[PDB]
Amino acid sequence: VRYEASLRQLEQRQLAKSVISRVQSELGNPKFQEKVLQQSISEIEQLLSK
Amino acid sequence: EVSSILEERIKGVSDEANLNETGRVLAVGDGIARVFGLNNIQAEELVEFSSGVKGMALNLEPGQVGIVLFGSDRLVKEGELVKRTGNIVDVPVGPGLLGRVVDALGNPIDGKGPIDAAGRSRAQVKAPGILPRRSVHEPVQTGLKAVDALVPIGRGQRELIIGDRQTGKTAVALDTILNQKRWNNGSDESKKLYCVYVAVGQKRSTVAQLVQTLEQHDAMKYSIIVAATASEAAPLQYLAPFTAASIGEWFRDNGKHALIVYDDLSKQAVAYRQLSLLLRRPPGREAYPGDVFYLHSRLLERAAKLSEKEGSGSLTALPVIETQGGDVSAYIPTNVISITDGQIFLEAELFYKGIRPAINVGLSVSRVGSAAQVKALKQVAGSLKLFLAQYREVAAFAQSDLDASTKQTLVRGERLTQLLKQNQYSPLATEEQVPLIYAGVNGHLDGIELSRIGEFESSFLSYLKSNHNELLTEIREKGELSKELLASLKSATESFVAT
Amino acid sequence: PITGKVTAVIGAIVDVHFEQSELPAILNALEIKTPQGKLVLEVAQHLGENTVRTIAMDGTEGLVRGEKVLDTGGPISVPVGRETLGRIINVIGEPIDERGPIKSKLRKPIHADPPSFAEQSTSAEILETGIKVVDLLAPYARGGKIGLFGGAGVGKTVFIQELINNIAKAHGGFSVFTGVGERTREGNDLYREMKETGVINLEGESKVALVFGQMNEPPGARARVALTGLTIAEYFRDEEGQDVLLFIDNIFRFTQAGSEVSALLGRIPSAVGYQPTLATDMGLLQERITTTKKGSVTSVQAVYVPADDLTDPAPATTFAHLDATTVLSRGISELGIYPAVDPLDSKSRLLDAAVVGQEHYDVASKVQETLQTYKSLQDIIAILGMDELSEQDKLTVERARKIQRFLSQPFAVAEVFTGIPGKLVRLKDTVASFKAVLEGKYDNIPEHAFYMVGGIEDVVAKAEKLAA
Amino acid sequence: NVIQDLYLRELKDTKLAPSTLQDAEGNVKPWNPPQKPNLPELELQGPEALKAYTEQNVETAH
Amino acid sequence: AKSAANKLDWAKVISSLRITGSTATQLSSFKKRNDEARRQLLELQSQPTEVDFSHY
């Protein structure tokens, strides 16, 4: 049971490094630009809801 | 697996909320930041920085607001955007905190999932008025006979435990929690105590031992542990007792009886001292800031035996003061002493000279104790405090007092002292304490040679239970001794003593 | 590139005004290239308006106000690794043992938050000590802080050397001797001695890593030296899963260095002139010392009381952190005892009955009671005469004077130094030794046939030699 | 949005595979086997003892 | 049961009190008391034999 819990924690920190891999992926892509356009229009919608 | 569920939770977070206002940090360091804007801020609000750290605005000044960082400086950065939480500093309160270690913010450092809490309640809340209070009457049985006769403690009662560093200071309180395990493993809500152990200024390692100890004695399930370790930031430590008391007040305001042990308010003083100095507010007496009295008093008075009209509330308070080599004259100790009613001064000399627990009886008082005290323990406790202040006097001049009267007292006194001693982390039942005090008071303990007193205690108790536990059950319910019960006990005590 | 021009040099507190939107962060490391190579300044405030207030880690002998600064980007990163074992490294993390680049692979920030509540071990454990005296009367606890008291040279330094040898055999862990406010002459001797006793084998492998923080260092660099050492230890524990033993020299001088840095930072010094941040700084230092699941650091610290005033805040703060105290005395060493440990002043807070074993506890309590009674007994026995020694009294005296000698254990580092072959007496055999003397089994073997010998097994030999 | 991108991509595209049970054995304490019926006890064995004890005693000593 | 053992133990003490009633009979009583007291705390100590493959 002890090793099982340890393995679950180990999986979580390994998947933490998978987040790092994804961070490098987003900031590479011109999704960095294109999803910023999406954020722009989302804020336009948000600020219009005021 | 669990990762998939966490990822589901991650999918479950995504805001779109508008920020009412932010600020931008100016000069920052000394655990205070000076922010520009925050004009619509409430006083003592919680603000969350974009480092994710949260702080409480303390000084609202014309044109600037000065946050106090509840959290490390390293995280906070210059010209960072400070967002208003919008709420006065509150902490989650509820029924689900039992058996959960939490840090001061209420984060689950136990890690038994996100805390189950009914509400949140403001960190500072005014103490109930005169009209809300009602005089104490119910006992708290610590399982340490001295701390149940010599100092009786009751429900909702303010009291003080003062003494020298790490003499297992903590153990004295732990024993109370342990003793009331059987009362709390009761089904009577009135006799249930929900005990909160506030660990302030203690090593995170030491706290981990404590938690494990409590879980070894399986006492965790009725108790909350709040933690503000030495590593944890000085402002977090400052707000730590106040936050703990809020949780306690939720129980108190459930009418439920509880206890909160604040270990150590002496460390709260050092923390507040640090904070004050870092706020560049002028040092007070003994270099402890001038509002240190106010700090303690506001904390302490939030513990009360609320009147039956207002709920019958109780929240007993035991605050643990670490004297620097004794000497109760000392600004921080005296300030505390004045607030508290009763003291349980512990003597280092006696501790060294193998009296565990080392309860100095010269400097232990209980200024409201006798009301709490059970009638059984009033009857059997026949001015034992006086008697052992005759022992105290007798041995003062013994090294003269060669009078047979003094010697008789000395023989009783020394032997009585042996009875007081109790092996820590093994507390005696209240019912069981009644005969022991009967024996010694009624002087049947002169009939026991000093060396064999320890044997006598266990054997006497075994004898009584076997002979007739009927008596013990009777005093267990009656809580008084009739002339017959008293005689039966006298007779029975004579029987074992003889044997 | 975050660069800024020096806009003050009031003392060693150098304020640097940085170009816009190129702002450091608190605890970052700045490097100013100097004809002294580099000067490392650590950002300890932001004064706003794109200015900082920093402390220095090297003595600032003058800069031109307006000198370009380059920001490293974070708290000083010092090399760590098995390479750094047997390397004297100054505070900034560069070799002063001049064995060239010691860079094993990675360097790591000098600051690093204490392990989490979860990380903490839930139950106390014992660190083995070859010193039998230690294992009876105050057994070391792995994870813990054990605060040395006593002499120097023949006192403390030899004791420290002994521990390094013992650890290498005992666990095979690592150590890092960090010396704070160390007289460089004394440090030189220590380096040479450490080479001689082979805890540092230049050609060979080295156990102890040395971090020396000299007295001529500026107070800021004195303050951070300890944290640097701690980082080295944490690499061993966390990333090599080993036990470590971290020596610190005066933690009084940790306090002293810290007090100055507060005052320099302008903060109002709290009572007795000690830091307003006195508690927290010790707290950070002494909560990174713990038993993690991975490993455990254990730290022996040296506490030099300020005028023996225990009541002073600095000893008190230290004592709060301390778990055990080892109280060497030179009077005791003068009673011919090596180790020099004063047994009645030897105390551990994990001398607890449960922790050390009930049997061990009972044996220990008896030996303590025996010694305690013996010491007091000798006071009036000497005056009154030995004729006053009753059958009961002389039973204790015979055993006690035999125990007193039995404590004397020649040990491996000082095998040369005393000239007597070393003994590393392990804990199980320690229990055995005292059990027998308590049971008086070997109470029939002469007093000096327990002088300068190790365990129970050993005094079988010595008995033979006494006869021979 | 970006949360969704990170979440989606991470979950789908990165999947760890656990180690074998054999690797687990090292990291756990594996099943200890039965303790065996040891050896039964025969006390006061042989009529050597019986005759000896009956004969030897003939008086109760202190 | 246990009461037989202890009654004979103390009985033999009061027999030896008079004209000697035991030498090593009382030592037999002492020995049976030792292990008899060990087995009762063993028997109350007893682990449940079923592996909790339900919960754990």
DSSP for C225-289? HHHHHHHHHHHHHHHH-----EEEEESHHHHHHHHHHHHHHT---BGGGB-TTHHHHHHHHTTSS
Give C99's Cβ-side CA count (13 Å radius).
15
Does the distance separating the beta carbons of A50 and B2 come in below 8 Å? no
Q: D28, D54, D59, D60: which to substitute to probe chain E, counting the most E Cβ within 10 Å? A: D60
Q: Give B96-157 as a DSSP string.
A: GGTT-EEETT---SS-SSSPP-SEEEESS-PPP-STTB----SEE--S-SHHHHTS-EETT-
Q: A4, A12, A22, A40: which to substitute to probe chain D, counting the most D Cβ within 10 Å? A: A22
Nearest to C270 by CA among C222, C319, C320, C317: C317
Nearest to B437 by CA among B482, B483, B397, B493: B493
Q: What is the resolution of this structure in A?
A: 4.6
Nearby residues of C430 by Cβ (< 8 Å), 6 or more positions away:
C132, C135, C136, C455
- Written as six digits, the tokens of C427 are 């804990």
d(CA C403, CA C375): 12
Q: Report yes or no: D4 at the B interface, CB cutoff 8 Å.
A: yes
Report the SS3 class of residue B34. strand
Nearest to C27 among B74, B78, B234 (CB): B74
d(CA B116, CA D53): 74
Q: Which of B122, B133, B182, B367 is catalytic?
A: B367
Q: What angle do CA A17, A23, A24 make, to 5 degrees?
A: 95
Phi first, then psi: give them for residue B375, nearest 5 degrees.
-65, -30
B243 is in an annotated binding site: no
H helix and E strand count, chain A: 2, 0
Secondary structure E strands in B324-368: 343-346, 359-365
- Written as six digits, the tokens of B253 are 């305001």
Using the structure block, give the residue that is written with the tokens 């030792």: E34
H helix and E strand count, chain C: 14, 16
Q: What angle do CA A21, A25, A26 make, to 5 degrees?
A: 125
Helix axes D2-13, A31-48, angle to 10 degrees: 140
C185, C198 contact by CB (below 8 A):
no
d(CA B373, CA E15): 50
Report the SS3 class of residue C34. strand
Does the distance separating the beta carbons of D57 and E20 come in below 8 Å? no
d(CA B330, CA B321): 12
B169, B207 contact by CB (below 8 A):
no
- Any chains having at least 3 CB pairs less than 8 A from chain D are A, B, E
> Per CATH, is B15-87 categorized as 2.40.30.20?
yes
Q: Report yes or no: B230 at the C interface, CB cutoff 8 Å.
A: yes
Task: Flag whether E touches C (3+ CB pairs, 8 A cutoff).
Answer: no
Phi first, then psi: give them for residue E55, nearest 5 degrees.
-80, -55
Distances (CA, A) of B228 to B52, B93, B295: 19, 17, 17
Residue ranges and CATH numbers for the domains of chain C are 1-75 (2.40.10.170), 76-350 (3.40.50.300), 351-468 (1.10.1140.10)
Phi first, then psi: give them for residue B114, nearest 5 degrees.
-60, 135
- Any chains having at least 3 CB pairs less than 8 A from chain B are A, C, D
Q: Report yes or no: B16 at the A interface, CB cutoff 8 Å.
A: yes
Q: Which CATH superfamily is domain B374-499 in?
A: ATP synthase alpha/beta chain, C-terminal domain (1.20.150.20)
Chain B residues within an 8 Å CB radius of C26: 28-29, 73-74, 76-77
Q: Report yes or no: D61 at the E interface, CB cutoff 8 Å.
A: yes
Please give the single-letter amino acid code of residue C167: I
C155 is in an annotated binding site: yes
Report the SS3 class of residue C73. strand
Give C66's Cβ-side CA count (13 Å radius).
0
d(CA C206, CA C137): 30
Using the structure block, give the residue that is written with the tokens 């003050």: C8
Structural biology method used: cryo-EM
B105, B78 contact by CB (below 8 A):
no
Phi first, then psi: give them for residue C285, nearest 5 degrees.
-65, -40
B450, B457 contact by CB (below 8 A):
no
Helix ranges, C266-386 (H): 278-285, 313-321, 330-333, 353-356, 358-384
d(CA B279, CA B274): 9
Question: What residues are paired with B57 via a beta bridge?
Answer: B67
Give me the count of residues in chain B: 499
Distances (CA, A) of D22 to A1, B158, D16, D28: 15, 59, 18, 10
Nearby residues of B276 by Cβ (< 8 Å), 6 or more positions away:
B283, B289, B291
- Written as six digits, the tokens of C454 are 């190790």
**E42 burial type by CB count under 10 A (0-12 exposed, 13-18 middle, 19+ buried):** exposed
Does the distance separating the beta carbons of C48 and B283 come in below 8 Å? no
Does the distance separating the beta carbons of B4 and D7 come in below 8 Å? no
Chain B residues within an 8 Å CB radius of C47: 27, 29
Closest-CA distance, E18 to chain D, in angstroms, reads 11
DSSP state of C130: S
Q: By 3-state DSSP, what share of chain E in percent is helix, strand and coil, each rounded to 5?
A: 65, 0, 35
Give C301's Cβ-side CA count (13 Å radius).
31
- Cis-peptide, bond into residue B264, ω within 30° of zero: yes
Q: By 3-state DSSP, what share of chain A in percent is helix, strand and coil, each rounded to 5?
A: 85, 0, 15
B47: left (phi over 0), alpha (psi -120 to 50) or beta: beta
d(CA B201, CA C318): 13
d(CA B323, CA B343): 13
d(CA C414, CA C175): 19
d(CA B462, CA B464): 5
Give me the count of residues in chain D: 62
- Written as six digits, the tokens of C366 are 């008896």
Nearest to C425 by CA among C57, C132, C39, C36: C132
Interfacial B residues in 6-25 facing D (CB < 8 Å): 7, 10-11, 13-14
Does the distance separating the beta carbons of A12 and B6 come in below 8 Å? yes
Does the distance separating the beta carbons of A18 and D2 come in below 8 Å? no
- Written as six digits, the tokens of B186 are 């009761």
- Written as six digits, the tokens of D45 are 């064995």
Phi first, then psi: give them for residue B38, nearest 5 degrees.
60, 40
Nearest to B29 among C26, C117, C124 (CB): C26
Task: Flag whether E touches B (3+ CB pairs, 8 A cutoff).
Answer: no
Alpha carbon C341 to chain centroid, angstroms: 16
d(CA C295, CA C280): 25
C298, C244 contact by CB (below 8 A):
yes
Q: Report yes or no: D3 at the A interface, CB cutoff 8 Å.
A: no
DSSP state of B318: E
Does the distance separating the beta carbons of B233 and C283 come in below 8 Å? no
Please give the single-letter amino acid code of residue C349: R
Chain D residues within an 8 Å CB radius of E51: none
Distances (CA, A) of B471 to B457, B481, B498: 17, 9, 19
Does the distance separating the beta carbons of B16 and A12 come in below 8 Å? no
Q: Is the dihedral of CA D56, D61, D62, E1 positive or negative?
A: positive
d(CA C209, CA C232): 9
Nearest to B72 by CA among B92, B55, B91, B90: B55
B327 is in an annotated binding site: no
d(CA B341, CA B339): 7
Closest-CA distance, B274 to chain C, in angstroms, reads 5
C181: left (phi over 0), alpha (psi -120 to 50) or beta: left
Helix axes B265-278, C278-285, angle to 10 degrees: 110
- Written as six digits, the tokens of B365 are 């008082």
Closest-CA distance, B307 to chain A, in angstroms, reads 49
Nearby residues of B77 by Cβ (< 8 Å), 6 or more positions away:
B25, B28, B51, C23, C25, C26, C46
Catalytic residues of C: 156, 182-183
d(CA A40, CA B73): 33
Nearest to B3 among A15, A47, A50 (CB): A15
- Written as six digits, the tokens of C286 are 């002494």
B168 is in an annotated binding site: yes
DSSP state of B444: T
Using the structure block, give the residue that is written with the tokens 């002493």: B337
Using the structure block, give the residue that is written with the tokens 């065996």: D36
> Residues of B240-275 as b/e, b for ≥16 C-beta within 10 angstroms?
bbbbbbbbbbbbbbeebbbbbbbbbbbbbbbbbbbb
Question: What residues are paired with C326 via a beta bridge?
Answer: C148
Nearby residues of C431 by Cβ (< 8 Å), 6 or more positions away:
C136, C359, C360, C363
Chain B residues within an 8 Å CB radius of A42: 16
- SS3 of C172-205: CCCEEEEEEEECHHHHHHHHHHHHHCCCCCCCCC
Domain boundaries, chain B: 15-87, 88-373, 374-499
Give C83's Cβ-side CA count (13 Å radius).
16
Stated as kind and residue range, the H or E segment containing B226 is strand B223-228
User: How large is the greatest C-alpha to C-alpha distance in chain C, in angstroms?
Assistant: 89
Nearby residues of B185 by Cβ (< 8 Å), 6 or more positions away:
B222
d(CA B422, CA B437): 14
Alpha carbon B21 to chain centroid, angstroms: 41
Q: D3, D4, D5: which to substitute to probe chain A, counting the most A Cβ within 10 Å? A: D5
d(CA C105, CA C83): 9
Q: Is the dihedral of CA B460, B465, B469, B474 positive or negative?
A: positive
Chain D residues within an 8 Å CB radius of B7: 7, 10-11
Question: What residues are paired with C52 via a beta bridge?
Answer: C46
Q: Report yes or no: D29 at the E interface, CB cutoff 8 Å.
A: no
d(CA C51, CA C6): 9
Stated as kind and residue range, the H or E segment containing C448 is none
Distances (CA, A) of B69 to B125, B227, B281, D12, D27: 21, 18, 17, 40, 43
C107, C117 contact by CB (below 8 A):
no
d(CA B127, CA B297): 10
Size of interface D-E (CB pairs under 8 A): 10
d(CA B242, CA B478): 39
Nearest to B209 among C118, C124, C282 (CB): C124
Q: B2, B3, B6, B9: which to substitute to probe chain D, counting the most D Cβ within 10 Å? A: B3
- Give the residue on C whose Cα is nearest the Cα of B228: C117
Helix axes C278-285, C313-321, angle to 10 degrees: 30
C164, C178 contact by CB (below 8 A):
no
- Give the residue on B whose Cα is nearest the Cα of A12: B3
B152: left (phi over 0), alpha (psi -120 to 50) or beta: beta
DSSP state of C328: B
d(CA C122, CA B205): 8
Report the SS3 class of residue B321. strand
Closest-CA distance, B53 to chain D, in angstroms, reads 22
Does the distance separating the beta carbons of E21 and D61 come in below 8 Å? no
Using the structure block, give the residue that is written with the tokens 């804007």: B37
d(CA B45, CA B83): 11
Report the SS3 class of residue C317. helix
Alpha carbon B45 to chain centroid, angstroms: 29
d(CA C178, CA C299): 10
- Give the residue on D whose Cα is nearest the Cα of B8: D7
Stated as kind and residue range, the H or E segment containing D27 is helix D21-27
D10: left (phi over 0), alpha (psi -120 to 50) or beta: alpha
- Written as six digits, the tokens of E48 are 């449940």
- Give the residue on D whose Cα is nearest the Cα of E19: D60
Nearest to C276 among B72, B267, B277 (CB): B277
DSSP state of B450: G
Phi first, then psi: give them for residue C53, nearest 5 degrees.
-130, 130
Phi first, then psi: give them for residue B64, nearest 5 degrees.
-150, 155
Give the end-to-end CA distance of chain C in Å, rounded to a whole number.
80
Stated as kind and residue range, the H or E segment containing C357 is none
Nearest to D28 among A3, A14, A23 (CB): A3
Q: Report yes or no: D62 at the E interface, CB cutoff 8 Å.
A: yes
Please give the single-letter amino acid code of residue D34: P
Nearest to B69 by CA among B28, B29, B32, B105: B32
Interfacial B residues in 418-447 facing C (CB < 8 Å): none
| Bridge pairing between strands C51-56 and C13-18 | antiparallel
- Give the residue on A whose Cα is nearest the Cα of D17: A11
DSSP state of C115: P
d(CA C295, CA C143): 9
Helix ranges, B264-308 (H): 265-278, 292-300
| Bridge pairing between strands B54-61 and B45-49 | antiparallel
Q: Report yes or no: D32 at the E interface, CB cutoff 8 Å.
A: no
Distances (CA, A) of B362 to B146, B157, B324, B366, B377: 13, 21, 19, 12, 21
The dotted CATH code for B88-373 is 3.40.50.300
d(CA C103, CA B440): 73
